[PDB]
Write a protein that binds this ligand. Structure first.
Ligand SMILES: [Zn+2]
Ligand SMILES: [Zn+2]
Lengths: 307, 307
């Protein structure tokens, strides 16, 4: 039922010391969609550079070949025509628009009025649709926004509710939420807009992202974001391997992920990204199954290991 | 207010490929108690071997020298006179007794009746007190016990409530709990025995140990167990560095831990244990602060880093 958006390729490209070659990104994207069976993959950020543009084009060429074109998403910005033009040239068909989700961010970075910014936003979305794209919208810094400026947040969502978008992403951008706060923030919007597909996007700064995600599910979220091995800036994103296992074992919700591919996915990302994981890393660590009286539902063969 | 028991030295000694020399254990114990300022340290398991016996003796010699003798705890077993004699010779003054906390474990491993086992337990506790020791008791496999055999659990705690012990530990031994389940299990006992000092002991198998701990605090726990870098078997224990930060920032409870020593503690354990942590490891990872609009309460100087 729940959709899973992997952001390993986009955020990983942001991680210190990490840079995937075109072949590597292609290899990883293919595995995530076909083997792990994640619903969608966010593979790059618009306007980063050519080559990246080239990488996305090569990935889209393949995607067409497999009828997976709409499962690839590109993170973009409210920059007029730039992001949309870039994506148009890339061959990608889905834009994940980064919009200021807190009054504080809007004012301090853009110095624009909510109405003025909402207008810039409407321009991008309309132009995107004109250009043959579908749009998902990130409420950047939402975790601070609903706690310090809930009015702005409500007006933003209200504006977007009138727009022709596919989903609204609720990101704990700076990773400052507790599970309680997450349920509250999510519940606050899902009740007001019961007809909108919201997805929660956690960050692991306090090692609370999977727990926050579970509460997000409790509040009515229809999707969740995560990355393999938590790859990403700072403390990274919600760890996909642990998120999926926890959803399957500790919640009454489901995912389309093939658990058996989880181990190889982690190994793939670790080698290609060059970012080592610890041996005790939940579900995927080398020593995680070592030690029937002491048996957990977390068995090695379940994730394609030890057989 | 909340007490913190570090189990890095005891559980780490159990971790695959890990073995601390006497000097290393001494160095680490000293840092944990004097610098990080954790309340107590569980440094070894009784009867493991001589040398370990020697290591504990050397550590106690030092402890006396600093008036810290009672802050060192030794994990022991219901084995008659063996564990107590071992601890007596070690110089340690506190026993953390491992007792079967689930009917399933009791029957499958000991094949004894609750009354028969409770008698073995009373023998150890009495002999321990006779030997000049203080006792804390672990309800091993409690996380499965209160969910699959709450009657046995209640009778066990009832028996222990009549015993002269210092605290009762509620361990999620196999690391199978969700935060909701943790609050329920803990709340169930704290209400029946409001005059007992319970502590929650989480395991990170689902990357839910810090979240479970927060709920444990909510249910009335007076202490929590954790280890540096989550060192320990399988997925390890609740990560001390993240647990403390989360308690301080996301709960109204407090800890005596000196946050500024957190980074060096992690580096110390990583080098001596030989178990690498990932660069994105919450609060302590190398890239955790890299990337004032995007600033978290999690600053480098707060944990003794970047200055
Ligand atoms: Zn993010
Ligand atoms: Zn344990």
């Amino acid at each position: 039922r729940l959709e899973i958006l992997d952001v390993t390729l986009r955020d990983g490209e942001q991680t210190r010391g990490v840079s995937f070659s075109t072949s590597e990104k292609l290899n990883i994207a293919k595995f995530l969609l076909q083997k792990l069976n994640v619903d969608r993959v966010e593979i790059a950020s618009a306007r980063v550079s050519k080559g990246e543009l080239e990488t996305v084009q090569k990935i889209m060429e393949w995607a067409a070949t497999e009828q997976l074109t709409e499962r690839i998403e590109i993170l973009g910005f409210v920059d007029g025509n730039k992001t949309v033009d870039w994506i148009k040239d890339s061959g990608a068909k889905v834009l994940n628009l980064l919009t200021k989700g807190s009054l504080h961010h809007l004012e301090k970075q853009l110095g624009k009025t909510p109405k003025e910014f909402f207008t810039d936003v409407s321009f991008v979305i309309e132009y995107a649709i004109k250009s043959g794209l579908k749009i998902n919208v990130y409420l950047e810094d939402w975790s601070n926004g609903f706690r310090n400026s809930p009015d702005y947040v409500k007006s933003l969502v209200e504006h977007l509710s009138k727009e022709h978008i596919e989903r609204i992403f609720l990101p704990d951008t700076l990773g400052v939420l507790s599970p309680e706060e997450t349920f509250q923030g999510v519940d606050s919007l899902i009740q007001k807009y019961p007809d909108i597909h919201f997805e929660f996007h956690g960050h692991n700064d306090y090692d609370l992202s999977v727990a926050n995600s579970l509460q997000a599910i409790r509040a009515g979220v229809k999707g969740l974001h995560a990355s393999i091995n938590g790859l990403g800036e700072r403390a990274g994103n919600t760890p996909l391997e642990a998120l999926v296992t926890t959803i399957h074992d500790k919640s009454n919700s489901k995912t389309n992920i093939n658990e058996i591919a989880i181990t190889e996915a982690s190994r793939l990302v670790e080698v290609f990204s060059g970012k080592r994981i610890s041996a005790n890393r939940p579900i995927v660590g080398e020593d995680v199954f070592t030690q029937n009286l002491y048996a957990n539902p977390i068995l090695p063969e379940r994730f394609g290991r030890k057989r």
